[PDB]
Amino acid sequence: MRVVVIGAGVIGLSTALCIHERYHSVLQPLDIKVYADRFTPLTTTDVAAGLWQPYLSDPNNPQEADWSQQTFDYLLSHVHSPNAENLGLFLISGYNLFHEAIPDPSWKDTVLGFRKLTPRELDMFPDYGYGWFHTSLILEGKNYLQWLTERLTERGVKFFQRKVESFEEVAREGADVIVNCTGVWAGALQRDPLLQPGRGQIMKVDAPWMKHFILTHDPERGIYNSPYIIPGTQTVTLGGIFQLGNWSELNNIQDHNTIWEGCCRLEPTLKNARIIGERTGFRPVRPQIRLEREQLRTGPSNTEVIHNYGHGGYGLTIHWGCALEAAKLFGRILEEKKLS
Amino acid sequence: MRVVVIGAGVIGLSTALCIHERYHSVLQPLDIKVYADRFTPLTTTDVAAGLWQPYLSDPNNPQEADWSQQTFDYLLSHVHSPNAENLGLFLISGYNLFHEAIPDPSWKDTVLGFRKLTPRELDMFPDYGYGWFHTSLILEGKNYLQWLTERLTERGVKFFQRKVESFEEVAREGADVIVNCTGVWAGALQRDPLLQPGRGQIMKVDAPWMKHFILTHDPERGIYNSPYIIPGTQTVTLGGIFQLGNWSELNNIQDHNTIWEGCCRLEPTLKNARIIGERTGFRPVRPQIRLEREQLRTGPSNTEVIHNYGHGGYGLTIHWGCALEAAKLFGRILEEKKLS
Ligand SMILES: Cc1cc2nc3c(=O)[nH]c(=O)nc-3n(C[C@H](O)[C@H](O)[C@H](O)COP(=O)(O)OP(=O)(O)OC[C@H]3O[C@@H](n4cnc5c(N)ncnc54)[C@H](O)[C@@H]3O)c2cc1C
Numbered sequence: 001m002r003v004v005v006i007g008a009g010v011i012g013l014s015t016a017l018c019i020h021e022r023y024h025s026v027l028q029p030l031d032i033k034v035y036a037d038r039f040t041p042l043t044t045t046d047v048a049a050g051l052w053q054p055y056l057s058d059p060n061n062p063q064e065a066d067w068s069q070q071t072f073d074y075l076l077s078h079v080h081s082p083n084a085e086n087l088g089l090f091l092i093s094g095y096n097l098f099h100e101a102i103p104d105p106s107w108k109d110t111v112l113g114f115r116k117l118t119p120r121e122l123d124m125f126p127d128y129g130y131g132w133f134h135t136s137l138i139l140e141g142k143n144y145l146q147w148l149t150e151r152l153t154e155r156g157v158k159f160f161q162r163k164v165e166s167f168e169e170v171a172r173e174g175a176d177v178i179v180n181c182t183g184v185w186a187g188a189l190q191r192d193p194l195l196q197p198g199r200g201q202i203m204k205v206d207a208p209w210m211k212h213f214i215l216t217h218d219p220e221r222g223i224y225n226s227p228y229i230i231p232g233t234q235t236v237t238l239g240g241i242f243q244l245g246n247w248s249e250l251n252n253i254q255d256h257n258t259i260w261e262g263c264c265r266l267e268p269t270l271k272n273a274r275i276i277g278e279r280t281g282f283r284p285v286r287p288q289i290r291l292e293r294e295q296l297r298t299g300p301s302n303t304e305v306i307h308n309y310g311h312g313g314y315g316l317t318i319h320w321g322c323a324l325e326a327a328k329l330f331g332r333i334l335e336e337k338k339l340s
Numbered sequence: 341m342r343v344v345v346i347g348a349g350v351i352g353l354s355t356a357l358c359i360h361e362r363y364h365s366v367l368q369p370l371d372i373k374v375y376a377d378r379f380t381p382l383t384t385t386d387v388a389a390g391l392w393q394p395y396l397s398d399p400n401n402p403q404e405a406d407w408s409q410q411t412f413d414y415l416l417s418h419v420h421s422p423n424a425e426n427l428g429l430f431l432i433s434g435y436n437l438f439h440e441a442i443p444d445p446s447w448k449d450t451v452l453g454f455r456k457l458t459p460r461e462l463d464m465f466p467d468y469g470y471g472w473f474h475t476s477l478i479l480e481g482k483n484y485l486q487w488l489t490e491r492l493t494e495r496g497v498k499f500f501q502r503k504v505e506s507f508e509e510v511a512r513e514g515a516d517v518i519v520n521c522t523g524v525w526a527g528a529l530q531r532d533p534l535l536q537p538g539r540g541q542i543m544k545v546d547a548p549w550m551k552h553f554i555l556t557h558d559p560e561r562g563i564y565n566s567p568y569i570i571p572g573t574q575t576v577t578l579g580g581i582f583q584l585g586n587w588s589e590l591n592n593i594q595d596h597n598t599i600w601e602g603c604c605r606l607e608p609t610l611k612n613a614r615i616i617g618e619r620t621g622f623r624p625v626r627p628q629i630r631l632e633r634e635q636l637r638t639g640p641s642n643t644e645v646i647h648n649y650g651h652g653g654y655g656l657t658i659h660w661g662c663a664l665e666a667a668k669l670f671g672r673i674l675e676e677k678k679l680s
Pocket residue numbers: 006007008009010011012035036037038039043044045046047048049050051052053162163164165181182183184185186188189198199200201202239280281282283284309310311312313314315316317318
């Protein structure tokens with residue numbers, strides 16, 4: 001009963017934890033190994049601010065909306081425990097600003113105190129005439145990854161630093177079930193023409209007087225290509241870069257200047273904030289998450305593959321409803337094989 | 341035309357600035373001196389978190405409500421300037437939690453996005469069943485005092501470190517108008533049986549993941565004797581001590597334990613927050629602010645006194661409507677004396 005999880009981002013770690021907590025007793029010799037090229041300080045998950053916010057549109061897969069809601073409910077129930085800070089979990093309120101009166105989100109009742117912005121609030125942001133105010137949650141990738149790692153270490157999950165070349169290489173080592181949580185790099189193991197990098201560039205700035213997130217929206221320039229300010233525990237994340245199909249894992253001045261100019265206009269107090277760091281990340285963009293079973297009859301033995309990737313810019317927002325669904329798929333592998 | 345302001349807290353400094361900005365041209369040789377025992381890092385103003393919040397009750401003096409509103413409007417208009425951080429000025433949202441359904445405040449429309457808490461929000465705080473959520477402003481005393489000082493230094497206002505024994509001592513030095521902004525210590529210069537210390541004890545804790553203020557209310561134990569959490573730029577203020585008539589300028593373990601136990605129950609994540617400092621302050625409590633003219637015919641020459649003290653736990657919330665009213669009273673001294 002050997003299980004290999006490929007990837008140590010929020011997807012891989014949360015899935016490994018979910019499978020363990022649901023099947024560690026059910027199956028007595030349950031072996032779980034985590035195979036990843038990049039761990040905990042250097043994944044895409046570490047680059048994310050961690051704000052819980054799904055896309056404004058209804059998902060292509062109606063299950064995704066339920067997956068997001070399940071994660072918010074799981075996270076909100078732990079927000080007040082004396083542990084919540086080890087997870088990098090905290091409540092935060094803020095603004096979603098629009099150029100016109102768009103419909104309310106599907107998640108309007110999932111979040112706390114959702115409402116329409118008043119004219120006195122809209123007066124504070126001179127280029128926007130519509131908006132929302134609500135209270136959401138930030139789950140910082142860096143801390144959450146460290147937390148999931150500790151939980152996995154105490155549960156006997158063994159971690160391995162390696163770049164996997166094919167699923168066959170893994171199957172040959174004697175892994176019955178393979179959990180593929182490769183993120184943006186999932187194409188390298190099995191070509192997927194629906195998966196593409198959603199290049200983002202962000203600035204981490206010291207502005208501790210910023211207590212609210214501010215996300216702006218423009219249908220013209222599209223999703224995440226508009227300014228955003230997301231306060232974290234130690235720093236403030238400045239962003240607004242979204243370049244589909246760009247694999248440049250390097251910061252660039254044009255993107256820097258665009259984030260700076262755009263964020264300073266939104267919040268002019270930022271002109272005196274110190275820049276601590278700047279980073280680049282690839283959102284694993286797909287029309288919908290690939291979370292399904294596949295048979296590797298093309299390779300060694302029977303050997304089933306659980307795909308779990310393509311979380312775009314909403315990986316942290318959705319991860320828990322995903323890990324649970326993957327844990328449900330893992331159970332179906334046990335019952336179908338006549339292994340009750 | 342010599343003017344002496346006694347006090348370098350928010351009251352004295354904001355009044356000195358207001359008189360200067362309104363009468364520096366009107367009167368060509370306008371001499372302004374600031375006399376204070378304790379300056380900028382050590383006043384009661386430095387101990388205040390700086391949240392804009394008047395009392396839940398309608399003021400005894402209906403002008404006080406207009407004075408608070410004038411300060412919020414003045415501060416909100418400067419919240420977004422690239423300077424706002426030199427002032428220690430920032431927007432903040434949060435909770436006011438009650439044991440029962442009390443009426444809406446007088447200031448419900450002064451604040452941003454004021455609303456009643458929903459049942460899902462009230463579920464987060466197990467001992468409270470009613471509440472409000474709104475967006476207010478924090479004006480940090482420490483930074484604001486440094487700002488007013490710089491503004492006064494560039495305007496030629498001369499500062500003097502001394503303990504004034506009587507108004508007569510000041511009148512004898514040749515001061516025509518005396519502005520008395522002595523705060524809680526105003527009784528020492530002229531007995532005032534309405535003015536009393538509102539002893540408060542606070543903890544400054546490192547909890548940067550706290551993005552909202554939380555103020556609790558109990559009619560049983562009274563005003564500010566209930567837990568409160570107020571995040572600042574660099575630290576989180578923990579409080580809930582209000583002892584009328586207690587002059588103990590010393591922290592005590594009973595008050596410490598009361599703030600700790602009460603705040604940790606409100607927000608259990610605080611159990612792992614580091615204590616950076618603890619302080620004691622005396623709110624200058626009076627049934628209403630004394631902001632009026634008095635003739636010192638009892639002392640040297642004619643010599644008018646402008647009283648400006650007794651701002652309780654709402655000094656920063658009200659200071660600007662006060663400084664403006666004092667500046668208006670100073671003008672009445674010029675026109676009555678047949679000095680047009
Ligand atoms: C700038 C930016 C901001 C974002 N902000 C938010 C946000 O506020 N909220 C939110 O909900 N989401 C956000 N996201 C999205 C979030 O970061 C992702 O959806 C989530 O981190 C992706 O998780 P993952 O586990 O799919 O990928 P990753 O974090 O990339 O991890 C994939 C893992 O698989 C590994 N791997 C890949 N190929 C192999 C191989 N052959 N062998 C071994 N290992 C392999 C990598 O080494 C890595 O460990 C943001 C993204 C970016 C870039």
